[PDB]
Point group: none
């Protein structure tokens, strides 16, 4: 007729076979089941995540290999350092023999110094990828995972002749002396005067009292220094040695004083710095100040009430609350004469703001120089607790040591002491010239020389009863070398543990990569059998459909031969 419905079904069934055949061909050529999101959207997403993880795990295997390389290089350098240290130890054992002369000791010291220089050279020159692995106490992070944060830390340490405790190590240095027995010439050089009654030279030693700066340097944790005497001008400049800063409760009183510190803390351009204003209304009314002034609560311009409470909206006839508003209100309290136990602990500093009648108060932090400057025209007092004893010292506005209280002094050895002065009387033997101590006013002090002993001249030029001195490595040299060897061995042990951990990590990464590859294969990879079977079926249907369509184009020919 004019319509060929059968040809239309033939065409539709044919066009289905083209689609099936094309899908089979694409899957066969590409080797992938999921060639598009059409095939499997969820499968494609899971497969892409698996692909990203697999690529990251392979790159993490490479990174772990790099970490292995770093550890191997560092341990190789440390092995040479250990060999040099062991040779130095053998030379030191040789040097302790008494048969060696000074020339022998110097010849041994030549090689010892050469090996120490070699240790330093290995430290400064060993490098992996431009990283001095033996120069810094740092932590190298090796990414052994496909996601952020998965890493292994190699704890690198600085190993030179100085950090090992071998700086200035020697065996040829001078060992002990004889102290050059003192005579009357040493006595008159030291300042001793002779009493004509007995002829025994008396030496009076007077020490210098510690300055306020000296004691401020000698302050310990928690030590309290009061600065001021008049009215309430005394300031409790308690020293927080945890930070090296002297905290103190500062107090302001005037309107401009409330105007300043409110402006000092502020967000520069577009930040939202936040200070904890804590009033006894029932909670800490913390604000959200933005830019210059413009104090706000919950993102809306704030308003102070009669009682000082913070709210984000007040009556129409009221300007917005600024930082100065709340902060001077803290200065002036609340409800007029009410105490208003209040505070403005703004991100740190606790602006308590007094809270009796008016005024400010806040635990500000000054420095040692600040307290020294403050205590320059007023009296100061130091309380040295921490040790049960109090040892309270005082200083006038002039700055001299107070007669009252404990008078601390500094000796000629640079050590603080309470022995301000002491007299020692020596007698000079007219026959041999020997000088022997006789009397000591400091009867129980640490500076007393035992009576009757010969006095010698120390290497530092001071009179003493000791007869020897120092100058070489008198500290046990083999013990120091053993300590250095122990440090090197500890670092080597840490590196070996890290190497084992990296080996385990590489094994785990390999296994996980293989397993995830199998999992992704089960989703994305095509099958030879299934796709070739689909191809063959689609081809057979294609041929059948073409034959059927060719036949169907012939029936209306007969029909219209009957209707024509």
């Amino acid at each position: 007729i004019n319509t060929n419905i059968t040809s239309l079904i033939a065409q539709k069934n044919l066009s289905s076979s083209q689609s099936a055949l094309t899908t089979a061909m694409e899957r066969l050529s590409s080797g992938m089941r999921i060639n598009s999101a059409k095939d499997d959207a969820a499968g494609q997403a899971i497969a892409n995540r698996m692909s990203s993880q697999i690529t990251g795990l392979t790159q993490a295997q490479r990174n772990a290999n790099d970490g292995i390389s770093v550890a191997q290089t560092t341990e190789g350098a440390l092995d040479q350092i250990n060999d040099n240290l062991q040779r130095i130890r053998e030379l030191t054992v040789q040097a302790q023999n008494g048969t060696n002369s000074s020339e022998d000791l110097t010849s041994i010291q030549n090689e010892i110094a050469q090996r120490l220089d070699e240790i330093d050279r290995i430290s400064q020159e060993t490098e992996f990828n431009g990283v001095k692995v033996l120069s810094k106490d740092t932590n190298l992070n090796i990414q052994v995972g496909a996601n952020d944060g998965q890493s292994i830390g190699i704890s690198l340490k600085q190993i030179n002749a100085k950090t090992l405790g071998l700086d200035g190590f020697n065996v040829d240095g001078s060992g002990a002396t004889q102290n050059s027995t003192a005579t009357v010439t040493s006595l008159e050089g030291a300042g001793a005067v002779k009493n004509s009654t007995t002829g025994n030279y008396v030496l009076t030693t007077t020490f210098d009292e510690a300055s306020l700066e000296r004691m401020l340097g000698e302050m310990k944790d928690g030590d309290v220094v009061t600065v001021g005497s008049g009215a309430s001008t005394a300031v409790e400049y308690t020293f927080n040695t945890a930070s090296g800063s002297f905290t103190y409760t500062a107090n302001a009183t005037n309107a401009a004083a409330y105007g300043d510190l409110a402006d000092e803390l502020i967000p520069p351009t577009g930040s939202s710095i936040t200070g904890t204003y804590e009033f006894a209304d029932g909670n800490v009314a913390t604000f959200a100040v933005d830019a210059s002034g413009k104090l706000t609560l919950d993102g809306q311009a704030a308003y102070v009430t009669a009682t000082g409470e913070l709210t984000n909206n007040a009556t129409s006839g009221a300007t917005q609350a600024t930082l100065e508003d709340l902060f001077a209100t803290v200065g002036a309290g609340a409800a007029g004469t009410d105490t208003s136990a209040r505070s403005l602990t703004v991100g740190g500093v606790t602006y308590t703001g007094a809270g009796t009648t008016a005024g400010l108060s806040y635990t500000d932090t000054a420095t040692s120089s600040d307290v020294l400057a403050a205590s320059a025209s007023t009296v100061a007092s130091i309380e040295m607790h921490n040790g049960i004893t109090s040892a309270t010292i005082d200083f006038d506005n002039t700055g001299a040591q107070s007669s009252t209280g404990t008078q601390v002094y500094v000796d000629e050895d640079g050590q603080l002491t309470t022995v301000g002065s002491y007299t020692t009387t020596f007698a000079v033997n007219a026959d041999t010239g020997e000088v022997t101590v006789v009397d000591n006013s400091d009867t129980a002090g640490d500076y007393a020389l035992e009576e009757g002993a010969t006095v010698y001249v120390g290497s530092n030029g001071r009179l003493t009863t000791s007869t020897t001195s120092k100058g070489d490595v008198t500290e046990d040299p083999l013990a120091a070398l053993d300590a250095a060897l122990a440090s090197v061995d500890a670092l080597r042990s840490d590196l070996g543990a890290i190497q084992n951990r990296f080996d385990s990590a590489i094994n785990n990464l390999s296994t996980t990569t293989t397993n995830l590859s199998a999992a992704r294969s089960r989703i994305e990879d095509a099958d030879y059998a299934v796709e070739v079977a689909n191809m063959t079926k689609a081809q057979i249907l294609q041929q059948a459909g073409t034959s059927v369509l060719a036949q169907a184009n012939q029936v209306p020919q007969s029909v219209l031969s009957l209707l024509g």
Copy 2:
């Protein structure tokens, strides 16, 4: 298809086998099980500490050998010192014989001094590695351990001819007697008054004035002692050393003196004395005097004439002349009015008249005590002929020297010296105590000790600038030699004990080194059988993995043929 999970597993197993193969290869080539801290961290550290100990112990063996060498050298020197001491002892035993003369004692002392010098030379020259082992009392420290403080002390002593107590050892006089340095106490004891201005000490040595009797005891031949004031009353006594007596001009101015002179010359019973009488005209008559003092002229009675002539012709009533008449005739002349001089020789003494004065002058002898008694009440003087001063020494009537005249003084040694007193100032070194000489008195004095020299207190207690003093033979020399031998034997015994201790220490060091080497071998050395087994297993696994990997890469290709 696209994934080859079987090939991935094959690759992982292949890599593991290759890593095991590499470890086995490295252990085989190195010969050590612990080639890194990866293998055994604690084992590596323990092996390193054991290596340090073993190296220290080998070096300690070397040091102990050095100590053995030092002890052997010192004992070898002491053997020669002992041989010299024994030869000296044998010579001393020889010297004690009473038949030895002074020459033989000097001959023995020559060899004794040579052997003492040899002992000193051995002491000063014996040296090990620049260490004089026989010169100081010290303690040599030999390091016999791998750590600090492990050491053995060789107690070395100073052995010379002085420390053995043989300084100034003699069998003849000789003698050394080391002097003692003078000090301030010596200056005070001597009598030196300290100069409080200059700090020096000034002593004044004074000599007593010469006494008359002491100087008559020092009288020489031909010298004169004049006693009396005035030329007409002085008596001159000329000394004779051969007779030891003083001869003088004795005068007889009275008849009593003539009678006493006759009485002195009176011979005993049966004795006669011959003499001669010279007349004024020169005639000489020979006479003999009998026991009664009565004169016999040629065996006949002698008579004195009116002119004093002696003849045997008898005058009527003339009395026979006695001995006394001759002196009267010679002195007072004949009849008291004859001024003719006469001479009479008798008793070996010649008596002559003054010619114008009645008296006899003759030569008479006297003793020193006679001169002293004569001068005990009248001024005296002594003329020195050969001596320090050939001048007159005057004495008052009281026997004291005249101030206005030459003064002679007797020194501290009983000898004559014109230096009455002398002076010397000493400086005192305030530091050392050494007493040096800065100045003396008049430089003419030979007693002036040397300038700028150390003064010494001699064995006599004197102050002299001379080291040593003349000593005597050694007392109990064999005991001193035995004591020196005992000291040498004691030091040799100490050295032998230290040698035995060093031998034991060396044995212990070798044993401990062997044991620690065995322990370190157990910890560190590689068992070669195990490592070869691991190598073979890894190689077989590598081949199997390569075959399996080839098959795994082969398996997917069936898809191509089965695709069609």
